[PDB]
Amino acid sequence: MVKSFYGYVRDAWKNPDETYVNELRWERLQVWRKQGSVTRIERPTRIDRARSLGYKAKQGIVVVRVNVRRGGLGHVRPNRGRRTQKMGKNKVSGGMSIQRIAEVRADRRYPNLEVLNSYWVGEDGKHKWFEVILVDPHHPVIKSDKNLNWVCDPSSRGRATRGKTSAGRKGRGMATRGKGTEKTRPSIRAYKSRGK
Amino acid sequence: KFDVPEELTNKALEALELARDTGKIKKGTNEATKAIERGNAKLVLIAEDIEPAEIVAHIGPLSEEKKAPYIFIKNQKELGAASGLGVSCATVAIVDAGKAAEMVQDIAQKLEALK
Amino acid sequence: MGKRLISQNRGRGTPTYRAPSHKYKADLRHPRVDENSSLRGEVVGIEHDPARSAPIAKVAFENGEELFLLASEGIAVGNIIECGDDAEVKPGNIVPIGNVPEGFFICNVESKPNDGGKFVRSSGVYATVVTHEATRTAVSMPSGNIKWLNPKCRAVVGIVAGSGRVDRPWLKAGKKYHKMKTRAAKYPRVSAVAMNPRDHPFGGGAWKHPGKPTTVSRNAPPGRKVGLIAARRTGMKR
RNA sequence: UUUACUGCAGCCUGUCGUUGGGUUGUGGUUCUGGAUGUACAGUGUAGGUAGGAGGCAUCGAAGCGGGUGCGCCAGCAUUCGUGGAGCCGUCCUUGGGACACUACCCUUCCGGGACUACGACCCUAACUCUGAGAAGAGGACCCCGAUAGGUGGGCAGUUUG
RNA sequence: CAUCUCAGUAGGAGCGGGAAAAGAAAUCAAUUGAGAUGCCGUAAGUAACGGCGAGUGAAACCGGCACAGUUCAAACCGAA
Ligand SMILES: [Mg+2]
Ligand SMILES: [Mg+2]
Ligand SMILES: [Mg+2]
Ligand SMILES: [Mg+2]
Ligand SMILES: [Mg+2]
Ligand SMILES: [Mg+2]
Ligand SMILES: [Mg+2]
Ligand SMILES: [Mg+2]
């Protein structure tokens, strides 16, 4: 079958535990642990996924590995008097996924760019790693572009901290239509947050 | 396997130059991969500096299953320079000898010896 | 919530329970020596350390840097020290415990190699080497227990100076008051049965008695492990 | 305040992940050498069972060995031989099962090799501590995320007609 | 009074414009149909939940306001 090499990379990352990618994981995890919270990397770790999510090789497009802990929302026991249903907090995991946390940290680190998408790249017993694709709206190469000039608009500022990314809309309960989405569209706030 | 001697690699680069000026070469990972899949490659040249390594990982087993002679090259810069390009090229492929056919077959025999 | 206890207040680290660090002369640790090195040095002065109530020695080494050292008894101004692997056994030198003979006294022993010394450091204490097996050596700690240490551990030979510090009774609240000003401890301490039931598990009542047994299990939550923590026995020997 | 009712932190322990490479004892999983299948024996070893029997055989079939799969040191296999016939059974050892080659597909035999889960031991390369660093010390344990059970006036909400 | 209710309310952190959010079916229907989204009316205090107690509580069909559809990834060419 006449197939592109993106297909082969996709297949290789389809089942990481049963290919050559496991050894590469073993080497890469050490170097990744030595690094910081947010790091700029020249090339994406998985080319096919990045191209699928809207990555091109031009100026003004940046890619970054973020580092986020595992587990639920670490929550404090209430100091004062609750009612025995609000008193417990150890089993109460959060309401925000880990991709959203990763993208928000990346946005906080880069004040001039704007988040586009992200994807899963690895994980171990203490950490998870994602890569976030960032686009610069004030670069002339982006402005001339016809498939990316929508980001040079006054409604795309802070695009990641208002739940407009793909993971944000997954977490808002708006990944589908029909039954079950009675109280999740066009927004959570519109229904007094009884959805989600 | 055994890494090919330096004279073999220089012979491969010279044949690459000759087929460039005279024949036809697909250069670029995507075009060379599709050429191997269809099956027309006289010889496959692959660099060994790729990070991430997934770019050229599939080439080896695919070529060996398709019965295609693949060689390894030390760096991207010289492979890119050979193809007639100011930028590095990860993998090229001699689709058509043009005039360097004899280098094609004798490099194939040399690779059989090394394997 | 009946008020937290004194132990939890020490946990927070309020200024009343923090050591007055600026009074102390210096931290005591062994000289740092690379592999297969042996540096020497002769004492320059004998000095008083307010953090332990015992003397310390100032030693100037051949490289140039001077260090305060835990002073073993008999150390005198002028004597040279030969810390290193090739040192001989004498009162004052620092040598591995693997090649220390049985019966010799040591002090300032380390836990793992190149710690600087953690055991046997108060006044007049000392430890002994008992046995030398191939992989370990057993030293009898001043508490009275046997500890199995690595043969490549460093410890100065002798006993710590200042022996007999507690043969002189206080006989006043004033003298013990003066000692406590250079420590983190609080002085004086109220007794639990004289407090209120908010303050302590034992407080309250029309007369001063504990009310509940003083021995507490090892699994009691913080804020309750007060008294005889997980005692195996009580009383004097009849 | 407590051995009032209901809960929640803290702590103790099992399981899953992080988490790798060997030493062997475990059990099947899985695989070979023989239908191993045999008491009323046998000329025969129920070549499971079974067209209740018909092809093999100096053009290879027998009684015997320490005994060759194995068992009743009998004897179907032709194996290392040994004599140089065990033929089917409509002479059924007239059967627990009565038996003949292109069938053993299957009592079984079980280097049990093989991935697996357990208990113990060893190793270093993950990981942890110390050091400016070389390096040293531990080590797949601990810490950590999740889940299950306990203890728990440490703390919370209430009731006490 | 403990599940429930008060209520996702009061309060907090982040982002942000003249509006914002949503938006072109892996949809809703029922036998056979409709054809992006938002807002208003109705369905309806109905279905559903609940010491089945007190209470909480929709959507689709249907009528209106206003109407608008498209762009990438890949297969083919390989710097055009
Ligand atoms: Mg940060
Ligand atoms: Mg908008
Ligand atoms: Mg109390
Ligand atoms: Mg109470
Ligand atoms: Mg109340
Ligand atoms: Mg602002
Ligand atoms: Mg949208
Ligand atoms: Mg409600």
Coordinates of N, CA, C and O in Angstrom, one line a residue, chain C residues 153-221:
Chain C
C153 N 34.5 4.1 57.4 CA 33.9 5.2 58.1 C 35.0 5.9 58.9 O 36.0 5.3 59.3
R154 N 34.9 7.2 59.1 CA 35.9 8.0 59.8 C 35.5 8.4 61.2 O 34.3 8.7 61.4
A155 N 36.4 8.4 62.1 CA 36.1 8.8 63.5 C 37.4 9.2 64.2 O 38.4 8.4 64.0
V156 N 37.4 10.3 64.9 CA 38.5 10.7 65.7 C 38.7 9.8 66.9 O 37.8 9.3 67.5
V157 N 40.0 9.5 67.2 CA 40.3 8.6 68.3 C 40.5 9.3 69.6 O 41.2 10.3 69.7
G158 N 39.8 8.8 70.6 CA 39.9 9.4 71.9 C 38.5 9.4 72.6 O 37.6 8.6 72.2
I159 N 38.2 10.4 73.5 CA 36.9 10.6 74.0 C 36.7 12.1 74.0 O 37.6 12.9 74.0
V160 N 35.4 12.5 73.9 CA 35.1 13.9 73.8 C 35.4 14.6 75.1 O 35.2 14.1 76.2
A161 N 35.9 15.8 75.0 CA 36.3 16.6 76.2 C 35.1 17.0 77.0 O 34.0 16.7 76.6
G162 N 35.4 17.7 78.1 CA 34.3 18.2 78.9 C 33.7 17.2 79.8 O 32.5 17.3 80.2
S163 N 34.4 16.1 80.1 CA 33.8 15.0 80.9 C 33.4 15.4 82.3 O 34.2 16.2 83.0
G164 N 32.3 15.0 82.8 CA 31.9 15.3 84.2 C 31.0 16.5 84.3 O 30.9 17.1 85.4
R165 N 30.4 17.0 83.2 CA 29.6 18.2 83.2 C 28.4 18.2 84.1 O 28.0 19.2 84.6
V166 N 27.9 17.0 84.4 CA 26.7 16.9 85.1 C 26.9 16.3 86.5 O 26.0 15.7 87.1
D167 N 28.1 16.5 87.1 CA 28.3 16.2 88.5 C 28.1 17.4 89.4 O 28.2 17.2 90.6
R168 N 27.8 18.5 88.8 CA 27.6 19.7 89.6 C 26.1 20.1 89.5 O 25.6 20.5 88.5
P169 N 25.4 20.0 90.6 CA 23.9 20.3 90.6 C 23.7 21.7 90.4 O 24.4 22.6 90.8
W170 N 22.5 22.0 89.8 CA 22.1 23.4 89.6 C 21.8 24.1 90.9 O 22.3 25.2 91.0
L171 N 21.0 23.5 91.7 CA 20.7 24.1 93.0 C 20.0 25.5 93.0 O 19.9 26.2 94.0
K172 N 19.6 25.9 91.8 CA 18.9 27.2 91.6 C 18.1 27.1 90.3 O 18.4 26.4 89.4
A173 N 17.1 28.0 90.3 CA 16.4 28.2 89.0 C 17.2 29.2 88.1 O 17.0 29.2 86.9
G174 N 18.1 30.0 88.8 CA 18.8 31.0 88.0 C 19.8 30.5 87.1 O 20.0 30.9 85.9
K175 N 20.6 29.5 87.6 CA 21.7 28.9 86.7 C 21.1 28.2 85.5 O 21.6 28.4 84.4
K176 N 20.1 27.3 85.8 CA 19.5 26.6 84.7 C 18.8 27.6 83.7 O 18.7 27.4 82.5
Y177 N 18.2 28.7 84.3 CA 17.7 29.8 83.4 C 18.8 30.3 82.5 O 18.5 30.5 81.3
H178 N 20.0 30.5 83.0 CA 21.0 31.1 82.2 C 21.5 30.2 81.1 O 21.8 30.6 80.0
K179 N 21.5 28.9 81.4 CA 21.8 27.9 80.3 C 20.8 28.0 79.2 O 21.2 27.9 78.0
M180 N 19.5 28.1 79.5 CA 18.5 27.9 78.5 C 18.4 29.1 77.6 O 17.6 29.0 76.6
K181 N 19.1 30.2 77.8 CA 19.0 31.4 76.9 C 19.7 31.1 75.6 O 19.4 31.8 74.6
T182 N 20.7 30.2 75.6 CA 21.4 29.9 74.4 C 20.9 28.5 73.8 O 21.7 27.9 73.1
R183 N 19.7 28.1 74.0 CA 19.1 26.9 73.5 C 17.7 27.3 73.0 O 17.1 28.3 73.3
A184 N 17.1 26.4 72.2 CA 15.8 26.5 71.7 C 14.7 26.1 72.7 O 13.6 26.5 72.5
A185 N 15.1 25.4 73.8 CA 14.2 25.0 74.8 C 13.5 26.1 75.5 O 14.0 27.2 75.6
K186 N 12.3 25.9 75.9 CA 11.5 26.8 76.7 C 11.7 26.5 78.2 O 11.6 25.4 78.6
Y187 N 11.8 27.6 79.0 CA 12.0 27.5 80.4 C 11.2 28.6 81.1 O 11.3 29.8 80.7
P188 N 10.3 28.3 82.1 CA 10.0 27.0 82.7 C 8.8 26.4 82.0 O 8.1 27.0 81.2
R189 N 8.5 25.1 82.4 CA 7.4 24.4 81.7 C 6.3 24.1 82.7 O 6.5 23.5 83.7
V190 N 5.1 24.5 82.3 CA 3.9 24.2 83.1 C 3.6 22.7 83.0 O 3.8 22.0 82.0
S191 N 3.0 22.1 84.1 CA 2.6 20.7 84.1 C 1.2 20.6 83.6 O 0.3 21.4 83.8
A192 N 0.9 19.4 82.9 CA -0.3 19.3 82.2 C -1.5 19.2 83.0 O -2.6 19.8 82.6
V193 N -1.5 18.6 84.2 CA -2.6 18.5 85.1 C -3.1 19.8 85.7 O -4.2 19.9 86.2
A194 N -2.3 20.9 85.5 CA -2.7 22.2 86.0 C -3.2 23.1 84.9 O -3.5 24.3 85.2
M195 N -3.4 22.6 83.7 CA -4.0 23.4 82.6 C -5.5 23.1 82.6 O -6.1 22.5 83.4
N196 N -6.2 23.7 81.6 CA -7.6 23.6 81.4 C -7.8 22.5 80.3 O -6.9 22.2 79.6
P197 N -9.0 22.0 80.2 CA -9.3 20.9 79.2 C -9.1 21.3 77.8 O -9.0 20.5 76.9
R198 N -9.2 22.6 77.5 CA -8.8 23.1 76.1 C -7.4 22.8 75.8 O -7.0 22.4 74.7
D199 N -6.5 23.1 76.8 CA -5.1 23.2 76.5 C -4.4 21.8 76.3 O -3.5 21.7 75.6
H200 N -4.9 20.8 77.1 CA -4.2 19.5 77.1 C -5.2 18.4 77.3 O -6.2 18.6 78.0
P201 N -4.9 17.2 76.9 CA -5.8 16.1 77.2 C -5.9 15.8 78.7 O -6.9 15.2 79.1
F202 N -4.9 16.2 79.5 CA -5.0 15.9 81.0 C -5.6 17.0 81.8 O -5.8 16.7 83.0
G203 N -5.9 18.1 81.3 CA -6.3 19.2 82.1 C -7.7 19.1 82.6 O -8.5 18.3 82.2
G204 N -8.0 20.0 83.6 CA -9.4 20.1 84.1 C -9.6 19.3 85.4 O -8.7 18.6 85.8
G205 N -10.8 19.4 85.9 CA -11.2 18.7 87.1 C -11.2 19.6 88.3 O -10.6 20.6 88.4
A206 N -11.9 19.1 89.4 CA -11.9 19.7 90.6 C -10.7 19.4 91.5 O -10.5 20.1 92.5
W207 N -9.9 18.5 91.1 CA -8.6 18.2 91.7 C -7.7 17.7 90.6 O -8.1 17.3 89.5
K208 N -6.4 17.8 90.9 CA -5.4 17.6 89.8 C -5.0 16.1 89.7 O -4.2 15.7 90.5
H209 N -5.6 15.4 88.8 CA -5.2 14.0 88.5 C -5.3 13.8 87.0 O -6.1 14.5 86.3
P210 N -4.6 12.9 86.4 CA -4.6 12.7 85.0 C -6.0 12.3 84.5 O -6.4 12.7 83.4
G211 N -6.7 11.5 85.2 CA -8.1 11.0 84.8 C -8.0 9.7 84.0 O -8.8 8.8 84.2
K212 N -7.2 9.7 82.9 CA -7.1 8.6 82.0 C -5.6 8.1 82.1 O -4.7 8.8 82.5
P213 N -5.4 6.9 81.6 CA -4.0 6.3 81.7 C -3.0 7.1 80.9 O -3.3 7.6 79.9
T214 N -1.8 7.2 81.5 CA -0.8 8.0 80.9 C -0.1 7.4 79.7 O 0.3 8.0 78.8
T215 N 0.0 6.0 79.7 CA 0.6 5.3 78.6 C -0.3 5.5 77.4 O -1.5 5.2 77.4
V216 N 0.2 5.9 76.2 CA -0.5 6.1 75.0 C 0.1 5.2 73.9 O 1.3 4.9 74.0
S217 N -0.7 4.7 73.0 CA -0.2 3.8 72.0 C 0.6 4.6 71.0 O 0.7 5.8 71.0
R218 N 1.3 3.8 70.2 CA 2.2 4.4 69.1 C 1.4 4.8 67.9 O 1.9 5.6 67.1
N219 N 0.1 4.5 67.8 CA -0.7 4.8 66.7 C -1.6 6.0 67.0 O -2.5 6.3 66.1
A220 N -1.5 6.7 68.1 CA -2.4 7.8 68.4 C -2.1 9.0 67.5 O -0.9 9.2 67.1
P221 N -3.1 9.7 67.1 CA -2.9 10.8 66.2 C -2.1 12.0 66.8 O -2.0 12.0 68.0

